[PDB]
Amino acid sequence: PISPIETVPVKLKPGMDGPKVKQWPLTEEKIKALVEICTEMEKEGKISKIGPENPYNTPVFAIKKKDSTKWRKLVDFRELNKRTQDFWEVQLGIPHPAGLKKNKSVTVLDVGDAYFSVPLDEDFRKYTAFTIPSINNETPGIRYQYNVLPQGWKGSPAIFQSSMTKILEPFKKQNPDIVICQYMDDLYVGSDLEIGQHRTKIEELRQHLLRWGLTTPDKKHQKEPPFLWMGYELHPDKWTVQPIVLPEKDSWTVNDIQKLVGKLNWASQIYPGIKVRQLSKLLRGTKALTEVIPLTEEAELELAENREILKEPVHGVYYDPSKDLIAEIQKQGQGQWTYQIYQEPFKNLKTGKYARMRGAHTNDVKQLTEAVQKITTESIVIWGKTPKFKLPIQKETWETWWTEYWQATWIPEWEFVNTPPLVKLWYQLEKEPIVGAETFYVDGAANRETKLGKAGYVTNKGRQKVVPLTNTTNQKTELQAIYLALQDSGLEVNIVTDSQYALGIIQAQPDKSESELVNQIIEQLIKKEKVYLAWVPAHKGIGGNEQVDKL
Amino acid sequence: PISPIETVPVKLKPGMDGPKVKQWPLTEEKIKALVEICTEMEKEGKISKIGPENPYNTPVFAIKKKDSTKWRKLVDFRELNKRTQDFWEVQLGIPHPAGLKKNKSVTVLDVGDAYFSVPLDEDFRKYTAFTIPSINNETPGIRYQYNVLPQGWKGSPAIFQSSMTKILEPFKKQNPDIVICQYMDDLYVGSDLEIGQHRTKIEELRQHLLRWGLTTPDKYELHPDKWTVQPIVLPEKDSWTVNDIQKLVGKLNWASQIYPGIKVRQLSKLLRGTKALTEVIPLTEEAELELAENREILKEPVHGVYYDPSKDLIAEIQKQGQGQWTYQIYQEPFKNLKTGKYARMRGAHTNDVKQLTEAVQKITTESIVIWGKTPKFKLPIQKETWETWWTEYWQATWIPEWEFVNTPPLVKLWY
Numbered sequence: 019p020i021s022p023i024e025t026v027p028v029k030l031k032p033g034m035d036g037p038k039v040k041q042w043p044l045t046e047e048k049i050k051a052l053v054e055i056c057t058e059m060e061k062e063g064k065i066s067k068i069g070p071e072n073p074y075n076t077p078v079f080a081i082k083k084k085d086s087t088k089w090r091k092l093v094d095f096r097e098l099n100k101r102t103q104d105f106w107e108v109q110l111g112i113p114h115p116a117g118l119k120k121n122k123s124v125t126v127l128d129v130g131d132a133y134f135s136v137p138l139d140e141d142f143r144k145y146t147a148f149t150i151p152s153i154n155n156e157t158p159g160i161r162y163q164y165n166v167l168p169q170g171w172k173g174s175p176a177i178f179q180s181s182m183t184k185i186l187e188p189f190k191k192q193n194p195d196i197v198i199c200q201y202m203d204d205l206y207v208g209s210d211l212e213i214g215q216h217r218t219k220i221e222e223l224r225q226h227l228l229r230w231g232l233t234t235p236d237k238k239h240q241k242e243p244p245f246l247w248m249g250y251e252l253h254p255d256k257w258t259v260q261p262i263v264l265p266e267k268d269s270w271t272v273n274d275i276q277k278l279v280g281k282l283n284w285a286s287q288i289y290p291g292i293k294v295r296q297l298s299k300l301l302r303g304t305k306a307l308t309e310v311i312p313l314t315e316e317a318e319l320e321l322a323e324n325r326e327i328l329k330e331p332v333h334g335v336y337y338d339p340s341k342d343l344i345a346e347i348q349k350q351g352q353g354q355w356t357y358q359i360y361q362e363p364f365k366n367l368k369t370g371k372y373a374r375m376r377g378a379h380t381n382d383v384k385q386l387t388e389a390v391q392k393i394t395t396e397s398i399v400i401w402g403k404t405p406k407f408k409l410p411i412q413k414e415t416w417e418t419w420w421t422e423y424w425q426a427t428w429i430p431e432w433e434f435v436n437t438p439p440l441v442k443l444w445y446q447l448e449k450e451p452i453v454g455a456e457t458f459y460v461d462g463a464a465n466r467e468t469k470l471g472k473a474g475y476v477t478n479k480g481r482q483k484v485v486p487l488t489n490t491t492n493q494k495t496e497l498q499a500i501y502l503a504l505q506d507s508g509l510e511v512n513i514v515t516d517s518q519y520a521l522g523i524i525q526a527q528p529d530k531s532e533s534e535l536v537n538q539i540i541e542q543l544i545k546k547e548k549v550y551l552a553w554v555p556a557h558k559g560i561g562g563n564e565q566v567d568k569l
Numbered sequence: 570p571i572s573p574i575e576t577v578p579v580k581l582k583p584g585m586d587g588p589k590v591k592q593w594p595l596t597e598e599k600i601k602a603l604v605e606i607c608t609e610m611e612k613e614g615k616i617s618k619i620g621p622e623n624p625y626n627t628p629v630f631a632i633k634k635k636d637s638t639k640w641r642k643l644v645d646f647r648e649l650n651k652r653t654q655d656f657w658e659v660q661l662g663i664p665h666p667a668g669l670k671k672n673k674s675v676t677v678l679d680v681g682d683a684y685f686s687v688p689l690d691e692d693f694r695k696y697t698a699f700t701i702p703s704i705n706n707e708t709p710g711i712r713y714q715y716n717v718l719p720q721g722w723k724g725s726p727a728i729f730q731s732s733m734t735k736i737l738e739p740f741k742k743q744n745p746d747i748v749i750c751q752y753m754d755d756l757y758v759g760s761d762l763e764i765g766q767h768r769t770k771i772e773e774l775r776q777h778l779l780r781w782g783l784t785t786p787d788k789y790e791l792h793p794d795k796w797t798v799q800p801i802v803l804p805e806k807d808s809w810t811v812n813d814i815q816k817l818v819g820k821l822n823w824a825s826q827i828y829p830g831i832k833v834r835q836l837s838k839l840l841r842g843t844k845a846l847t848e849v850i851p852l853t854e855e856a857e858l859e860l861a862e863n864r865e866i867l868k869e870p871v872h873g874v875y876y877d878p879s880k881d882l883i884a885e886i887q888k889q890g891q892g893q894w895t896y897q898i899y900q901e902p903f904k905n906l907k908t909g910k911y912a913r914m915r916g917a918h919t920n921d922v923k924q925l926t927e928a929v930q931k932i933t934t935e936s937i938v939i940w941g942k943t944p945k946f947k948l949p950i951q952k953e954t955w956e957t958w959w960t961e962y963w964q965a966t967w968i969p970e971w972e973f974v975n976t977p978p979l980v981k982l983w984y
């Protein structure tokens with residue numbers, strides 16, 4: 019029906035005016051198929067009659083469910099939505115099953131046609147104007163406008179949600195012990211009551227809603243598991259994600275990819291890695307909703323990756339507030355790490371993989387830290403608390419990093435786990451200069467233009483060297499010079515550079531980098547027994563430095 | 570004495586719309602706290618539940634202010650504060666007293682309670698919208714807006730000033746030598762009276778305010794007298810290696826960015842060559858002159874260092890190690906107004922974030938007491954690390970501005 023609830027006041031963006039978008043002519047079959055659907059709507063009071071004084075229009079379409087000859091009306095609101103005000107957030111957050119606690123009694127209701135059940139602000143109704151073309155191309159078109167929240171309009175979700183919340187409030191306060199989760203019109207009603215009294219309360223809830231025009235169709239979740247809610251299968255002692263299937267098409271239409279992105283946005287929240295960069299790009303520019311768009315080699319490859327993602331299944335158990343949360347992390351194949359959160363052994367609430375940072379040079383202890391932080395924030399969102407950590411690093415390793423590192427850093431309370439690989443620091447720069455070890459004064463430089471350069475050194479023992487290089491830059495030649503000295507040197511060495519840039523990288527004790535050059539330096543440093551890196555200002559004419567200049 | 574009054578129209582700086590900041594996730598504990606506070610605040614009429622047509626939002630959280638059982642709500646109005654008109658009540662007519670930093674004692678009184686008695690301009694309210702989150706995203710999340718002056722908002726002090734003035738006028742009469750300064754939600758009350766005689770005048774002032782509508786918490790104490798400065802210094806030895814001399818000619822070259830009065834010539838000399846780092850080099854070329862003359866130069870204040878109240882104070886902090894931290898407040902690079910060293914919670918303690926968060930608050934209190942203006946910090950931490958934990962150690966009713974950096978050999982130049 020149509021709820022007797024108060025409408026939410028709506029406004030168009032400041033300075034903007036309603037959509038005035040021209041509609042293109044459709045087939046006779048549709049121009050009737052629509053007149054047929056719009057009449058069933060004009061009846062129930064959803065849409066409503068209009069004509070003259072309405073200077074607005076939003077394009078209309080019609081499409082068939084390939085399997086049953088059913089045409090459904092599809093209004094293109096892309097323009098009314100650019101012109102509609104912003105509303106606050108429909109949670110980039112969707113409930114996670116592992117966050118649910120076990121409930122003796124459980125029910126899963128959904129409202130049929132939830133949107134048409136909520137009324138649209140009167141003063142905004144006119145901006146939803148659309149018209150059904152004429153077949154005989156004689157009749158002055160059939161102009162309509164909405165009286166209820168329209169599907170696809172910017173604020174329908176937010177306003178419906180706001181309206182559910184208010185209609186449920188009286189009941190939720192009336193029955194404080196029964197838990198209700200709500201994502202749109204999907205209600206997971208769980209209680210402690212016995213089948214008998216639960217089903218009773220469910221009935222007064224189904225009636226509290228009908229009283230406000232919100233219908234719970236007889237397709238109420240059976241009060242029998244598995245329950246399907248939010249895309250998960252809620253079994254009595256476990257849960258699983260219904261595998262997500264993405265369409266395989268030859269020809270993609272604006273509307274299709276538009277829908278693919280939606281589905282994938284939702285999904286990206288259960289599976290990480292899902293990318294919609296190269297697809298949202300296809301929706302760039304205002305192209306007819308049916309005009310076929312060709313997928314860029316990137317988009318075509320993006321979809322393939324996402325599809326590879328969603329093949330993996332996902333399952334877990336429910337949450338027990340009595341026990342402590344525990345999260346373990348394993349290092350895995352250079353830059354990835356997997357982890358699991360559980361309360362009981364091998365009964366995982368949730369698991370995942372965390373991908374390396376966008377950083378240019380990093381080390382394992384760093385990443386492990388970034389990892390701890392993500393699980394921490396994740397757990398707070400899901401359970402409201404932090405989990406105790408089981409980590410593959412020793413108190414000594416970390417206390418050594420926690421010491422030498424110049425940026426503030428911390429890891430919550432944890433416990434060591436012997437499961438290899440262990441995270442470790444692959445080398446230690448010497449604090450004090452090395453007595454007896456050769457001292458290399460290292461320097462480099464390139465021409466900001468030609469991009470040609472020279473990297474070399476000069477040691478105390480009179481040793482010298484200078485290599486010429488093409489397509490390089492000062493910075494790189496400076497690291498190149500440090501590399502040289504590290505090659506042409508003993509197991510213990512002293513290096514002196516004027517480059518603060520190069521000092522800064524090596525100083526962070528990187529065990530992996532993006533530029534091979536650094537990686538070579540890294541492998542070189544590891545093999546050395548003792549290394550001491552010193553810094554001195556440039557062109558001030560200091561030690562061998564002033565003379566390491568052979569340009 | 571301002572209650573069923575007419576509001577004071579308030580507007581946002583030109584071309585700027587209200588804030589739309591994400592509510593960071595909170596712990597079940599803090600949420601339950603925010604919930605009872607807001608439903609109480611809702612019954613007293615200070616806030617109102619709002620619809621979803623209000624598109625604005627400002628983060629919210631809770632803390633246990635300087636050691637109490639009770640949770641205090643704390644709204645992070647930094648963005649709103651930035652987009653709000655500069656207030657033209659310009660109580661700036663009440664310049665920051667230079668004696669507060671000179672007093673033997675300074676107590677800090679939370680007067681925030683005050684604000685909640687003055688109505689907020691009905692058109693400006695929509696911009697004070699905040700959201701109490703739900704655990705696991707199981708419910709929509711409670712959305713409120715303030716119907717009164719909100720603690721933490723830039724205009725509450727401005728708009729309530731007059732009224733504060735008229736409440737303190739009596740006390741200040743019967744108490745001439747006391748210095749009373751206000752910053753945001755707090756009263757800064759200093760005096761040169763013996764401690765016991767101080768803690769007495771305060772409890773007096775409390776009661777006084779108490780009899781005038783303002784309710785303050787029961788019996789923070791500072792002593793600006795002992796605040797000291799951290800001067801740049803050089804090492805002293807009997808044997809000096811090439812290494813020691815390089816690290817010395819190095820630091821000194823950087824300090825020349827602050828005091829031109831530094832010379833390294835008799836030291837750039839000593840490094841003539843290509844010697845081994847360890848080779849104990851002589852105390853040559855009257856270098857004593859450089860070291861000596863320069864050693865002194867680190868006792869004269871920079872050429873033209875003065876507090877311009879029209880610029881922002883900046884604060885860089887370096888982790889030194891061993892629970893020790895160094896910092897500098899300045900408005901113009903190298904023209905530090907102050908350089909200090911938090912180093913508290915030293916010896917037995919392991920939590921950088923906790924330490925850096927307590928330092929930031931300590932540097933901020935000092936900056937207010939001294940200039941009556943919080944500085945913008947440059948924190949030596951990673952964004953993600955700081956945002957995961959900082960709110961677990963915050964205890965101030967204000968939040969300063971901040972950004973994240975990467976510290977290089979600058980620590981060396983401050984140890």
Ligand SMILES: Nc1ncnc2c1ncn2[C@@H]1O[C@H](COP(=O)(O)OP(=O)(O)OP(=O)(O)O)[C@@H](O)[C@H]1O
Nearest residue numbers: 128129130131132133169170175201202203204248
């Ligand atoms: N769980 C959900 N996830 C995403 N969108 C939803 C969800 N529930 C409702 N909506 C949005 O609200 C619109 C209106 O809801 P409506 O009641 O018509 O359908 P539904 O909730 O998807 O299920 P049903 O068609 O069985 O009633 C949907 O078409 C959809 O765009």
Ligand SMILES: [Mn+2]
Nearest residue numbers: 129130131203
């Ligand atoms: Mn539904």
Ligand SMILES: [Mn+2]
Nearest residue numbers: 128202203204
């Ligand atoms: Mn639904």
Ligand SMILES: [Mn+2]
Nearest residue numbers: 461462516517
């Ligand atoms: Mn160089």
Ligand code: NA
Nearest residue numbers: 118119120121
């Ligand atoms: Na359950």
